[PDB]
Amino acid sequence: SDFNNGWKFTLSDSVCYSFVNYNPSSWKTVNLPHDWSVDLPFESTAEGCTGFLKGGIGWYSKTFDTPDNFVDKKCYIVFDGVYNNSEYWINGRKLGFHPYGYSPFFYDISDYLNPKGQENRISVRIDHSRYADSRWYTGSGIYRETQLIFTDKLHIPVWGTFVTTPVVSSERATVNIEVRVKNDYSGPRAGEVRTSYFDSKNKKVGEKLTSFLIEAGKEMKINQSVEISNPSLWDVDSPSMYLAKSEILVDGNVVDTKETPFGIRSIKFDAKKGFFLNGKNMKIKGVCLHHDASMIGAALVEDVWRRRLQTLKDGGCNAIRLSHNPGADAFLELCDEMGFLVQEEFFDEWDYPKDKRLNMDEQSIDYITRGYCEYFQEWAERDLKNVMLRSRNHPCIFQWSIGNEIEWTYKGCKESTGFFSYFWNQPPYSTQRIREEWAKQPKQTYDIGRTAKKLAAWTREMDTTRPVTANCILPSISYETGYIDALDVAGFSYRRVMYDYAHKNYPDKPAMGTENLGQWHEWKAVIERDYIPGMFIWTGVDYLGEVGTKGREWPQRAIGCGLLDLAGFEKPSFHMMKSLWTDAPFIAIYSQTANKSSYVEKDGKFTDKDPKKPWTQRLWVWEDVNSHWNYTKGEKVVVEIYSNCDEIELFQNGKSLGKRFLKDFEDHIYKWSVDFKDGNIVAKGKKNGKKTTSAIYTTKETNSIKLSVDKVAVDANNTDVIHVTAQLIDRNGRNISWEEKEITFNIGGNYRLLGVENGDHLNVLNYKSNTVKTYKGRALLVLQATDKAGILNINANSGSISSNDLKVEVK
């Protein structure tokens, strides 16, 4: 835990940094996890696919003494992730090179260590000079937590257990564990593996003891099976966790221990009926999450994600797709605790590169976009298996995904359909015709089907208890290459129109939405079909990058497709999804000028403005709708409600505007023509009896800054964070969202600025400033505690505008 503290770092290269006699004292001290690229300003001379932030070549360093009892023992240094092309040294000796940015790995450093009490030094060189080597923002550095593990020479390896539960019922659960035991002694050894099982409230619920005899140098696999009675099942509403404590015994003495958290749960994908979790037919209400926040970047700070996931959770989301790479262990541990089903991805591309600046097949070749494709042939198996070795015990995981939108990169695929000679239509070619066009294409060095088979084979060597999936952008062809035949569940990417086609032509293959637009028409298609068990919205939260393209130039730093923004504040699209996914009565009120709106009332009924852009084809980014009620007097306005209520009556200033029914609105958006005047809009709604009310009030000028805080007390553990929300209010404390202000925060006491954020995807801002422009009347400040305990006094200004005062105790 504390091994992650007190590292050194410099953004500069020199060969002599690896030598035994080099001292890095004049480098900057840092705590891991660290992403250096968010200490650099957004530069216009950088690339937009990686969010206009540079990389470069940075080094790390870490000093640690050999323990006073390092005799007949092993020492392993474990990294969860380093982005990327990293080289490792210890005490002047080269440990290795690790190309991929997202796989975990480790090094046996036991023989390299200096005698008891003396100083060892580790060095890491990180080459992110290819700073456009991704379609999204990556970060740069040791961006996830590390471990230094000391064990006995008779020990369980790192990731040395695998807990499975093949039979799960409410009376009993069969809980198996495989324990690997490595004998690094010079001669044979005898012992016992004792695995004890502990429930949520620390009561012992099972034990198994098995003898063994392992020869010198070798590894042995010990299978054990127990029966847990009346188990607490892991579910998204009730995420119960057990603890498996495996102990190596010589005589009756504990030589080594590993603790494996696990959860008891059955999962099943039926092709006719949908998906089943503990025998409940539930829809998957998923969202795609990139690994970056905004101000912290790729750095895995658990409290920053906890808040983001808590907001997604309360919006009715029960699943997360880690797009498009392996996630952090700390993030998986969070999904276990909070209750999310997790699809873990391995790769974004296989044998051939995607275009980093554009998308699809790569067009140009230059240095800064050279990605993992250089290493895939030699490294894919190691990376895939390490990911699975690290993550296969987490109960949250329920799908291994081998690829995202891979069809673009192999010649013949797109042209074997009839589309490109596709979003809203089915292939013009028949099943046999597509198959026949595929025979006629020129043979390349690599085949999508053959590589799909190898990856799926490797995946199943490590785990058969979870389905192999993939995100297929062209199902039609992938149904006939052997790519889909490799998978247990075929994920579709933006192919709602292909749901009936899968069910018509390939009915025994479970199929699902794995990347989808955040709209009702996508969800409509899922709930109308029992055989389509859910969808994953692109995206759950806004992410840096995928900009610098035609209509998304500097200074835009994110697309803005996310349900949440770069802060984690709720957007209109989040509320629309909340209305589709939650059960409690819900009403969110928005509006635009009748001119700026997408909708038109002609003779009562509402329709879409452009018939060539109807509600059935709405894409990723939601319209910039207003939540305020501060228009200019008399302006013609279109009010729109997102809601699960069957009846809503609307009231302007107390005068009724009339009841409207959800049955009428084909696009699932309530709509009212209104003539503006000051006062208030109030919506009252009923859902199968149960009532609810919401309202938007006209305000006066900006009078004050309202500061909210999420926690009024945290620990002095160098990791806990404070989230300070700033909001503009009028004289009577009504919230302002129609004018912006440059706000300056002031903080007394010992703290670390993580940064400031407003959630504007269209503009850049300095994260490490104490000043930030508000967006729709609000901003966010993120602080992190440090070593020092004390009190924090937080206030803010905008020149003449003042704020309430907040106090937070750091215990």
Residue numbers in the entry: 32 to 452, 459 to 848
Question: Which sentences from the paper describe this structure?
Answer:
determined the three-dimensional structures of these four agarases. initiated by GH86 or GH16B, which generates NAOS. depolymerized by GH86, and systematically saccharified by the exo-acting GH117B and GH2C enzymes. exo-acting β-d-galactosidases, while GH117A and GH117B are α-1,3-L-neoagarooligosaccharide hydrolases.
replaced with W657 and C598 in GH2C, respectively. to specifically accommodate the β-linked AHG residue. generate AOS products, which are substrates for GH2C.
